[PDB]
UniProtKB/Swiss-Prot annotation, chain A:
Annotated control of activity: Activated by GSTU20/FIP1.
Transmembrane domains' residue ranges: none
Name recorded for this polypeptide: Jasmonoyl--L-amino acid synthetase JAR1
Induction (free text): Rapidly induced by auxin. Accumulates locally in response to wounding.
Residue numbers binding jasmonate: 95, 322-325
Domain of life according to the entry: Eukaryota
Native organism: Arabidopsis thaliana
Phylogenetic lineage: Eukaryota, Viridiplantae, Streptophyta, Embryophyta, Tracheophyta
Main location per the UniProt record: cytoplasm
Subunit details: Interacts with GSTU20/FIP1 under continuous far red (cFR) light; this binding increases its activity and determines the priority of substrate binding.
Positions annotated to bind an L-alpha-amino acid: 160-164, 524-528
PANTHER family: GH3 DOMAIN-CONTAINING PROTEIN, JASMONOYL--L-AMINO ACID SYNTHETASE JAR1
Family stated for the protein in its record: Belongs to the IAA-amido conjugating enzyme family.
Binding locations of ATP: 92, 112, 115, 157, 162, 325-330, 551
Places the protein is found: Cytoplasm
Gene designation: JAR1
UniProtKB/Swiss-Prot annotation, chains B, C:
Chain ranges of the GST C-terminal domain: 85-205
Family to which this protein belongs: Belongs to the GST superfamily. Tau family.
Subcellular localization: Nucleus; Cytoplasm, Cytosol
Knockout or disruption consequences: Hyposensitive hypocotyl phenotype under continuous far red (cFR) light and a delayed flowering phenotype under long-day conditions.
Subunit architecture: Homodimerization. Interacts with JAR1/FIN219 under continuous far red (cFR) light to stimulate JAR1/FIN219 activity and substrate selectivity.
Domain GST N-terminal per the UniProt entry, residue ranges: 1-79
Regulation: induction: Induced by a gravistimulation.
Protein's GO biological process: glutathione metabolic process; regulation of response to red or far red light; response to gravity; toxin catabolic process
Name this polypeptide is given: Glutathione S-transferase U20
Summary of the function given for this chain in its UniProt record: Exhibits glutathione-dependent thiol transferase activities. Can use glutathione (GSH) and 1-chloro-2,4-dinitrobenzene (CDNB) as substrates. Involved in the regulation of far-red light influence on development. Regulator of the interplay between light and JA signaling by increasing JAR1/FIN219 efficiency. Maybe involved in gravitropic signal transduction.
EC numbers for this chain: 2.5.1.18
Amino acid sequence: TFDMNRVIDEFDEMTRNAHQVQKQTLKEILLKNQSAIYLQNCGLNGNATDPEEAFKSMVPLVTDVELEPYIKRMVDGDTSPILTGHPVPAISLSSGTSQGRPKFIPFTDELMENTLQLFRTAFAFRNRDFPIDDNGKALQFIFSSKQYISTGGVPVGTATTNVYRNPNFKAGMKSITSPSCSPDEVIFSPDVHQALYCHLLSGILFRDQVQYVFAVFAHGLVHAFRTFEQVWEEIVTDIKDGVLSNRITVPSVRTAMSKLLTPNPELAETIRTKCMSLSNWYGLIPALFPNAKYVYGIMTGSMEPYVPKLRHYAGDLPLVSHDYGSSEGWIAANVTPRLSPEEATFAVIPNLGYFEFLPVSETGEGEEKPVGLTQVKIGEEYEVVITNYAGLYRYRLGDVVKVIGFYNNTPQLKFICRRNLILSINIDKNTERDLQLSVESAAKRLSEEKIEVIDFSSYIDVSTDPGHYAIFWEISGETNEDVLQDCCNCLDRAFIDAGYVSSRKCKTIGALELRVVAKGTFRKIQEHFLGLGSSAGQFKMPRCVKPSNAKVLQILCENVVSSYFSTAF
Amino acid sequence: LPILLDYWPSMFGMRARVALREKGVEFEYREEDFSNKSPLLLQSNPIHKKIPVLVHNGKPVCESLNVVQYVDEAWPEKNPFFPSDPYGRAQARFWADFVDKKFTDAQFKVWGKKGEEQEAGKKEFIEAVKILESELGDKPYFGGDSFGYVDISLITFSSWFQAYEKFGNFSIESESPKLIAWAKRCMEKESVSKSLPDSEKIVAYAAEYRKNNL
Amino acid sequence: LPILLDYWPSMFGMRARVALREKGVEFEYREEDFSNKSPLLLQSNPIHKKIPVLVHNGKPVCESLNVVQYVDEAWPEKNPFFPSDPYGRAQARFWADFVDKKFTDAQFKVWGKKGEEQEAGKKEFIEAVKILESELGDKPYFGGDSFGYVDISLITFSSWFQAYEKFGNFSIESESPKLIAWAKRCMEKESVSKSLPDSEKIVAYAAEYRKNNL
Ligand SMILES: Nc1ncnc2c1ncn2[C@@H]1O[C@H](COP(=O)(O)OP(=O)(O)OP(=O)(O)O)[C@@H](O)[C@H]1O
Ligand SMILES: N[C@@H](CCC(=O)N[C@@H](CS)C(=O)NCC(=O)O)C(=O)O
Ligand SMILES: N[C@@H](CCC(=O)N[C@@H](CS)C(=O)NCC(=O)O)C(=O)O
Ligand SMILES: CC/C=C/C[C@H]1C(=O)CC[C@@H]1CC(=O)O
Ligand SMILES: CC(C)C[C@H](N)C(=O)O
């Protein structure tokens, strides 16, 4: 039961018992998770009166290459469990790569508890600073429109997808948020760009009731508001007649909107005047919802360049920076959210995992051994090492943090940029360039429609006979199939290398499938990643999916607006 | 500075622009109101009054394929569209003449006319794209080992492919895919990726044409 | 030896002959029966089966101006049909196609029709005759300072001039002394003196054609 005062005091206690809970989290994670096979590798049995020291002495550091094969055996037909407690309910990916190729991280229900308690706490502090009407609504550019099942019959899911479709999502979130304006069907629509379009429409639906405008990411926000500049007259024509634009095709979404559509010529008059009055769309968000206390999301590092344009759209409204952590592990929440993006910091929550930090101090890399979270030196920068319920134990995400200060007994951390980069040779290539050739080459036939490809990915399906590349697109708008079928042919025709020639012609691995998905998919991925919270480097998206890769994978198949197997050959 | 007399949906005007931009010329485009055919145009071809017209040394150069070999011969040092042999030249010319006859009239039939006229044109164009697909065989292009003469000739028809797909209510791709397939291949050339206007508008002009003459 | 698959009454057969003979090349002429086409002809001309087709070194060349251009390009060592300049060539190709379409369409209206279309064709052919006259002036040829590429394309119609005066009931000599006299100069050369069949034969055929087909 969400109460501002008890949760904050409790969190305060938690912050001041930060050292205790970190410890207790380590003992409890290991008890809960004692039987993991790498633990036999180190020699652990659990408990006793020397548990914490023994854990650090016995358990060595791990890279993506060491973790990828193991939990690879977890997902694909071997439903066999590997490193925390049971077999996993979901499956993940990490930005940047494991030697140029897919990385994976496990998912548990506890991460859902982590989410629900974290948002409870974060909402409270922010609601303390920005008090809301509990009878209002809010504009959330948020999706979980897609769930597919892996080759072994095990769900493989993004952070968006496993929260929002989680059986406990609705009841746990109802008490700590303003109800999303759009129906669950739109959020989970097979056609998200149009559903985002109806999401714009949706927050637009309950404007006065809207307390805040929420997207995980500021680039998400700029995307939406630039798109606004694009489509404001079409929306006004659509909503006015009581008939949505014929652009919109998927039936479930069509039914929901049809439940909401009847002719009203009146407001069209109001909108053409208001939208025409704007200056280069300055202060777009206050214009739309004059009374939103804040625009909410991560405003630092990679998203810092998009925040001013969003500021341009948000006017003089404050951009409130969101918390810092993920299914890989939650570290911090913003407990002074009124702080500006330039001065924004995040205070670590210590019950979600046992975290450690590798010193960079010396020159390069540093080769110093790690100290405790509260043992960190103020002012200096460290790489976060992760032990938790996410299947990573003393794991190097590969990421640099700064200690701005202590919020009571917990550290405040600050982050600049997006790049956690050392890279290797992939085997999902078809080098980044050639694959990029494939997207760009197929994209011009989308271009004749005045559309550019905003992003893209690919997957190797070894379930089928013959296996097949699946190419995925995030694009600006809806169009017809004939061109997208043409598309897929070009992606086949763009993969320059000969290897592709023998098989695809010989069909030993099958026809490439162009599964066309809608807006924000790759955004949700970036949302996931800079929101990973261990990190300053999280913005690099894996281009082609090995069996291992799973973030892009979750959002991939059902959200396919249209999917095609080449009618070529 | 080469002065071109063009028409936003001229597939032939596009043959010119694609040819010139493929070569390496900076040139100027002037859009025509064929209701009011220009003083300089009416002096370029006072009888056809037809474009594309590239103007060089103050000498009007006319007709689309004429203009593109004009493109070859005007800057003969960098990007040749033909190969070295005379026979290969004759083959590419052969096939540009192909592009220009049953192919153009058939598309003209599929977006320009209807009914008894329509299906004649529809099988004609599918027959066309099939002999076409057969001679493409394997080649990245057509008129040589690289971007070619007739590459320029028939690439510019692939923004009307959308028009054909819709009025014909067809899909020229399950019957002959490697062609359209080759087309969005040839779109990556900066010569056609900036010379050719959008297909939704081209589709709409076919729609304006149709709505006018029913 | 070069292989010519041809039809003796066809003007376009004759341009293959004029270009080949103008050069000095020795070739074998094969008279084709449209009712019973040669094996070589189906293989040489699968798509349109139209004469003449020249087989050289086992590669086929088809259509009218193209065979002439191939002939000029295949044997560039002696007498060149085109000008060295791109632009002059430009003019030639323009004028050659000019003779092949509009002059030729009105041309088919001359020997191949009756009634008001005949009247139309007659208006059209004398006028384009006048503009052929316009481009000319007081000179022997067309394509070059000697016998040229456009001369090649148009001189073959001179065998058919007797039919056009005949069926046209018009005075090409009186209105256009220049074109006919241009025809008789070209006739002075063995290239036309031995490639153009007796006009009596084609002139008889055309009438026989008229009688036979409605
Ligand atoms: N940063 C975050 N943003 C959103 N949800 C998160 C986040 N971190 C943890 N979660 C919870 O984790 C839940 C599911 O993410 P989940 O672990 O299933 O994805 P995964 O692919 O299996 O792992 P990962 O998200 O780390 O790549 C998510 O549904 C969400 O509720
Ligand atoms: N086949 C011709 C195409 C010529 C043609 O069809 N021209 C049309 C434009 S597509 C035209 O100019 N019409 C003149 C007018 O309508 O004013 C060529 O070789 O280019
Ligand atoms: N495309 C050929 C045209 C040749 C031609 O018209 N030949 C005549 C033979 S008299 C013909 O095709 N008649 C049509 C037929 O027999 O169906 C060329 O350029 O030479
Ligand atoms: C806790 C519930 C949702 C997860 C948090 C996410 C948002 O909803 C906004 C940014 C943030 C990204 C991140 O911290 O993972
Ligand atoms: C709101 C969150 C579910 C977004 C999340 N960071 C993701 O895209 O995975």
